[PDB]
Design an enzyme around this catalytic site. Structure first.
Site, PDB file in Angstrom:
ATOM      1  NE  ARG A  85      -2.222  -1.228   3.762  1.00 34.13           N
ATOM      2  CZ  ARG A  85      -1.587  -0.498   4.670  1.00 34.13           C
ATOM      3  NH1 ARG A  85      -1.479   0.820   4.580  1.00 34.13           N
ATOM      4  NH2 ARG A  85      -1.008  -1.116   5.687  1.00 34.13           N
ATOM      5  CE1 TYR A 233       0.557  -6.177  -1.294  1.00 37.18           C
ATOM      6  CE2 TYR A 233      -0.620  -4.180  -0.669  1.00 37.18           C
ATOM      7  CZ  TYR A 233      -0.048  -5.371  -0.316  1.00 37.18           C
ATOM      8  OH  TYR A 233      -0.100  -5.808   1.012  1.00 37.18           O
ATOM      9  CE  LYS A 242      -5.675  -3.874   5.469  1.00 42.09           C
ATOM     10  NZ  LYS A 242      -5.706  -4.608   6.780  1.00 42.09           N
ATOM     11  CG  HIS A 262      -6.188  -3.318  11.000  1.00 42.01           C
ATOM     12  ND1 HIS A 262      -4.943  -2.782  11.117  1.00 42.01           N
ATOM     13  CD2 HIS A 262      -6.074  -4.407  10.120  1.00 42.01           C
ATOM     14  CE1 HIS A 262      -4.073  -3.488  10.347  1.00 42.01           C
ATOM     15  NE2 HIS A 262      -4.764  -4.507   9.765  1.00 42.01           N
ATOM     16  CB  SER A 284       0.543  -4.005   8.929  1.00 44.96           C
ATOM     17  OG  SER A 284       1.195  -4.980   8.105  1.00 44.96           O
ATOM     18  CB  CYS A 286       1.967  -6.113  15.393  1.00 37.60           C
ATOM     19  SG  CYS A 286       3.040  -4.654  15.138  1.00 37.60           S
ATOM     20  CB  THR A 289      -2.308 -13.569  10.235  1.00 37.49           C
ATOM     21  OG1 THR A 289      -3.100 -12.577   9.550  1.00 37.49           O
ATOM     22  CG2 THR A 289      -2.493 -14.981   9.483  1.00 37.49           C
ATOM     23  CG  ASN A 290       1.738 -15.020  13.622  1.00 36.65           C
ATOM     24  OD1 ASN A 290       1.801 -13.878  13.163  1.00 36.65           O
ATOM     25  ND2 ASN A 290       2.542 -16.009  13.205  1.00 36.65           N
ATOM     26  CG  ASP A 309      -6.657  -7.619   7.869  1.00 40.39           C
ATOM     27  OD1 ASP A 309      -5.522  -7.303   8.448  1.00 40.39           O
ATOM     28  OD2 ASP A 309      -7.111  -6.912   6.947  1.00 40.39           O
ATOM     29  NE  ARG A 403       0.242  -8.693   2.980  1.00 36.82           N
ATOM     30  CZ  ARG A 403      -0.197  -8.305   4.191  1.00 36.82           C
ATOM     31  NH1 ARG A 403      -1.123  -9.035   4.841  1.00 36.82           N
ATOM     32  NH2 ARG A 403       0.258  -7.190   4.720  1.00 36.82           N
ATOM     33  CD  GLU A 522       4.938 -21.869  24.956  1.00 31.54           C
ATOM     34  OE1 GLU A 522       4.001 -22.019  25.747  1.00 31.54           O
ATOM     35  OE2 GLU A 522       5.772 -22.769  24.683  1.00 31.54           O
ATOM     36  CG  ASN A 523       1.491 -14.955  22.418  1.00 29.54           C
ATOM     37  OD1 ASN A 523       2.336 -14.720  23.287  1.00 29.54           O
ATOM     38  ND2 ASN A 523       1.574 -14.500  21.177  1.00 29.54           N
TER      39      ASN A 523
HETATM   40  N1  LIG Z   1       8.191 -12.357  18.924  1.00 32.15           N
HETATM   41  C1  LIG Z   1       6.961 -12.576  18.396  1.00 32.15           C
HETATM   42  N2  LIG Z   1       6.755 -12.241  17.098  1.00 32.15           N
HETATM   43  C2  LIG Z   1       5.499 -12.484  16.644  1.00 32.15           C
HETATM   44  C3  LIG Z   1       4.467 -13.073  17.460  1.00 32.15           C
HETATM   45  N3  LIG Z   1       3.354 -13.194  16.691  1.00 32.15           N
HETATM   46  C4  LIG Z   1       3.664 -12.733  15.469  1.00 32.15           C
HETATM   47  N4  LIG Z   1       4.982 -12.334  15.442  1.00 32.15           N
HETATM   48  C5  LIG Z   1       5.697 -11.669  14.339  1.00 32.15           C
HETATM   49  O1  LIG Z   1       4.796 -10.847  13.600  1.00 32.15           O
HETATM   50  C6  LIG Z   1       5.115 -10.876  12.203  1.00 32.15           C
HETATM   51  C7  LIG Z   1       3.967 -11.503  11.437  1.00 32.15           C
HETATM   52  O2  LIG Z   1       2.843 -10.657  11.583  1.00 32.15           O
HETATM   53  P1  LIG Z   1       2.020 -10.212  10.256  1.00 32.15           P
HETATM   54  O3  LIG Z   1       1.358 -11.415   9.656  1.00 32.15           O
HETATM   55  O4  LIG Z   1       2.817  -9.304   9.382  1.00 32.15           O
HETATM   56  O5  LIG Z   1       0.939  -9.341  11.052  1.00 32.15           O
HETATM   57  P2  LIG Z   1      -0.592  -8.992  10.840  1.00 32.15           P
HETATM   58  O6  LIG Z   1      -1.021  -8.288  12.077  1.00 32.15           O
HETATM   59  O7  LIG Z   1      -1.376 -10.234  10.479  1.00 32.15           O
HETATM   60  O8  LIG Z   1      -0.493  -7.952   9.608  1.00 32.15           O
HETATM   61  P3  LIG Z   1      -1.492  -7.571   8.348  1.00 32.15           P
HETATM   62  O9  LIG Z   1      -1.871  -8.880   7.750  1.00 32.15           O
HETATM   63  O10 LIG Z   1      -0.542  -6.774   7.486  1.00 32.15           O
HETATM   64  O11 LIG Z   1      -2.597  -6.803   8.982  1.00 32.15           O
HETATM   65  C8  LIG Z   1       6.352 -11.725  12.114  1.00 32.15           C
HETATM   66  O12 LIG Z   1       7.477 -10.840  12.234  1.00 32.15           O
HETATM   67  C9  LIG Z   1       6.229 -12.641  13.322  1.00 32.15           C
HETATM   68  O13 LIG Z   1       7.511 -13.128  13.762  1.00 32.15           O
HETATM   69  C10 LIG Z   1       4.795 -13.406  18.845  1.00 32.15           C
HETATM   70  O14 LIG Z   1       3.992 -13.938  19.609  1.00 32.15           O
HETATM   71  N5  LIG Z   1       6.059 -13.148  19.220  1.00 32.15           N
HETATM   72  O1  LIG Z   2      -1.631  -3.967   5.164  1.00 26.31           O
HETATM   73  C1  LIG Z   2      -2.431  -4.673   5.893  1.00 26.31           C
HETATM   74  O2  LIG Z   2      -2.747  -4.359   7.084  1.00 26.31           O
HETATM   75  C2  LIG Z   2      -3.034  -5.905   5.310  1.00 26.31           C
HETATM   76  O3  LIG Z   2      -2.965  -6.140   4.031  1.00 26.31           O
HETATM   77  O4  LIG Z   2      -3.749  -6.643   6.039  1.00 26.31           O
HETATM   78 MN   LIG Z   3      -2.481 -10.678   8.651  1.00 24.90          MN
HETATM   79 MN   LIG Z   4      -4.188  -5.720   7.947  1.00 24.21          MN
END
Ligand SMILES: Nc1nc2c(ncn2[C@@H]2O[C@H](COP(=O)(O)OP(=O)(O)OP(=O)(O)O)[C@@H](O)[C@H]2O)c(=O)[nH]1
Ligand SMILES: O=C([O-])C(=O)[O-]
Ligand SMILES: [Mn+2]
Ligand SMILES: [Mn+2]
Ligand code: NA
Length: 612
Positions: A85, A233, A242, A262, A284, A286, A289-290, A309, A403, A522-523
């Site tokens: 973006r 993109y 978005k 978001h 983003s 942070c 998705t995890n 998201d 992505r 672990e979260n």
């Molecule tokens: N240390 C640490 N890093 C984390 C954790 N969860 C996610 N990450 C980090 O976060 C990043 C992946 O997050 P993204 O998928 O970019 O985050 P998102 O919030 O889904 O972003 P958008 O899809 O862009 O909205 C990687 O650098 C991972 O290592 C955690 O519990 N600990």
């Molecule tokens: O950029 C972002 O936050 C995404 O694509 O989820």
């Molecule tokens: Mn994501």
């Molecule tokens: Mn996002």
């Protein structure tokens, strides 16, 4: 009804029928066909047959490659000028600047980017006339939200990119069933072009049409239009996500009494079988998705994903804050995705998935930094720049914002209510981002108004520590001060069941740069604490920033090496500078639009810190 052929584009339709379209959808298609001059009009039906033919067409044209290792997966590699973006080319048009963004005292707003109607009309006329010559205009009828849900909203996207059509089929509900559910109702008008009419005026890079110099992603909420030019993109071209589901929808939400955020939405079940839904806003990069797709390390717990998201949330008649995921898929960052960090993503993306800007292995699989899967000796890697690549090289094999685009239905832990039209009842809202110092692993807000302040004050490291309030800084559809007043107003809705608000920090580091908390699955130990707190458990100690876990309240079994004093510590000196900084930011960036209750929460935090 015409003296020649009117604006009748019937001869150019190569799928569907203009006659089948609702009147106002036909007007939108034909007016833009007149303007943009496409060679063909394809009215998308969303069918599997159509998707197959679209993918074939792109593959035959060299726009995408089949990834032969997997079941129906595909790879696009873009021009490197079109990979993310572009905030500085992303604008909202309103009559008055201050309705879109507060006026910054410094003359530089971090909270949005306004463009006048006059300037936009000039920019539009310098871009769109004839922009689709020689291309097909695809007509994508799509629903944001489960088809027919009272919380769902329909759009029509016109695009000259088959890549956008494929990715919209995954990320939204699209096709004839949407047109049928629409009938003669209102829809958001979404117009997109890659901005490279044929014959090409400049050379194509990587067979990826785009016009970086003229890229402009504009939002006209008072016309219910999104108009995007020059970028193919994702966030710039998949206009549902978005543009619509955050920027336009947030303004609609303000006017209509709901929220567009978001936020991931997850359902968590404890070992007793009790289930709660939580929403979480992190910027983003942070980790939404995890978390959304977490495989919890604690025995007997389960997480299920509603979305990763975007959340649309509205109080129901009983006072529950109900959330839907308006998306139909996950458009997730690929690098860093591994069995360790997101095993459920790894399972979801092995079939029916489109990858953009990742590396390709010699046996037809995908690769990226952090995948944590060794390759057999002899297997080689092609980077996302289409060059041979080896791990010693200066540059990554995948773009850092590459992505995957994958159907939500596929996720092994997709929640059973992920398409329930009434939404899921949210019992906690979590804020957080990347803070290497000062901010502990988890705290709980003292009240709704304190919690809205905690969202407002969010900061996260990305090229230094920057404000990203509510994780919405790129996404506000209107003036942030008014957005804060809208959140605060939820407290005055009678019999509202206001979710508990938390703040997390997975990213605190020791003096050597080392993460203090292992994170990922672990979260689950943090989410257990939140769950117990929503249940009213006496598991909290009061501190100046809010409630934190008591000593021994978190399950740390199996994590004896965690430095609990450092991870949980709160320093008067750090927090005095934090309040100092928040005050400077809110005065500069929000000023006259800052609600009294936010100012009061800032004073109350400062006072609590003063008593340390
Ligand atoms: N240390 C640490 N890093 C984390 C954790 N969860 C996610 N990450 C980090 O976060 C990043 C992946 O997050 P993204 O998928 O970019 O985050 P998102 O919030 O889904 O972003 P958008 O899809 O862009 O909205 C990687 O650098 C991972 O290592 C955690 O519990 N600990
Ligand atoms: O950029 C972002 O936050 C995404 O694509 O989820
Ligand atoms: Mn994501
Ligand atoms: Mn996002
Ligand atoms: Na390409």
């Amino acid at each position: 009804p015409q003296l020649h052929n009117g604006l009748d584009f019937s001869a150019k339709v190569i799928q569907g029928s203009l006659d089948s379209l609702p009147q106002e959808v036909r007007k939108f298609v034909e007016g833009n066909a007149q303007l943009c001059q496409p060679e063909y009009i394809h009215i998308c039906d969303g069918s599997e047959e159509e998707y197959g033919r679209l993918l074939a067409h792109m593959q035959e044209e060299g726009v995408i490659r089949k990834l032969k290792k997997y079941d129906n997966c595909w790879l696009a590699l873009t021009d490197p000028r079109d990979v993310a973006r572009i905030e500085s080319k992303t604008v909202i048009i309103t009559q008055e600047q201050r309705d879109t963004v507060p006026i910054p005292k410094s003359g530089q707003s971090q909270l949005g980017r306004w463009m006048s109607e006059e300037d936009f009309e000039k920019a539009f006329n310098a871009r769109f006339p004839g922009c689709m010559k020689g291309r097909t205009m695809y007509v994508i009828p799509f629903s944001m939200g489960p088809l027919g849900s009272p919380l769902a909203k329909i759009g029509i996207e016109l695009t000259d990119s088959p890549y956008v059509v494929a990715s919209m089929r995954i990320m939204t509900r699209m096709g004839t069933s949407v047109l049928e559910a629409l009938g003669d109702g209102e829809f958001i008008k979404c117009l997109h072009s890659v901005g490279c009419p044929l014959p090409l005026k400049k050379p194509l890079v990587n067979n990826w049409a785009c016009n970086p110099e003229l890229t402009l992603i504009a939002h006209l909420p008072d016309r219910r239009e999104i108009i995007s030019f020059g970028s193919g993109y994702g966030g710039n071209s998949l206009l549902g996500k978005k543009c619509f589901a955050l920027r336009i929808a947030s303004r609609l939400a303000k006017e209509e009494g709901w929220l567009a955020e978001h936020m991931l939405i997850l359902g968590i079940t404890n070992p007793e079988g009790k289930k709660k839904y939580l929403a979480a806003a992190f910027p983003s990069a942070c980790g939404k998705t995890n978390l959304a797709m977490m495989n919890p390390t604690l025995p007997g717990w389960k997480v299920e994903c509603v979305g990763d998201d975007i959340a649309w949330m509205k109080f129901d008649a009983q006072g529950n804050l109900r959330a839907i995921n308006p998306e139909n898929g996950f458009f997730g960052v690929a690098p860093g995705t591994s069995v360790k960090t997101n095993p459920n993503a790894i399972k979801t993306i092995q079939k029916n998935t489109i990858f953009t800007n990742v590396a390709e292995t010699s046996d037809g699989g995908v690769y990226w930094e952090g995948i944590d899967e060794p390759l057999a000796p002899g297997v080689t890697i092609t980077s996302w720049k289409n060059k041979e690549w080896r791990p010693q090289d200066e540059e990554p094999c995948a773009h850092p914002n590459s992505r995957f685009c994958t159907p939500a239905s596929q996720c092994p832990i997709i929640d059973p209510a992920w398409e329930s039209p009434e939404g899921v009842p949210i019992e906690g809202i979590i804020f957080g981002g990347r803070r290497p110092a000062g901010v502990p692993l988890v705290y709980e807000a003292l009240s709704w108004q304190h919690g809205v302040f905690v969202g407002a004050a969010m900061r996260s490291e990305g090229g230094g520590i920057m404000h990203d309030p509510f994780a919405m800084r790129p996404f506000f559809g209107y003036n942030f001060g008014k957005y804060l007043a809208h959140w605060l107003s939820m407290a005055h809705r009678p019999a509202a069941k206001l979710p508990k608000i938390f703040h997390v920090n997975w990213f605190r580091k020791d003096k050597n740069g080392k993460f203090l908390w292992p994170g990922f699955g672990e979260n689950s130990r943090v989410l257990e604490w939140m769950f117990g707190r929503i249940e009213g458990e006496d598991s909290a100690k009061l501190t100046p920033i809010g409630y934190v876990p008591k000593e021994d309240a978190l399950n740390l079994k199996g994590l004896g090496d965690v430095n609990v004093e450092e991870l949980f510590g709160i320093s008067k000196e750090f927090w005095e500078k934090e309040v100092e900084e928040i005050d400077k930011y809110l005065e500069d960036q929000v000023n006259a639009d800052l609600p009294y209750e936010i100012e009061r929460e800032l004073r109350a935090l400062k006072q609590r810190i003063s008593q340390m």
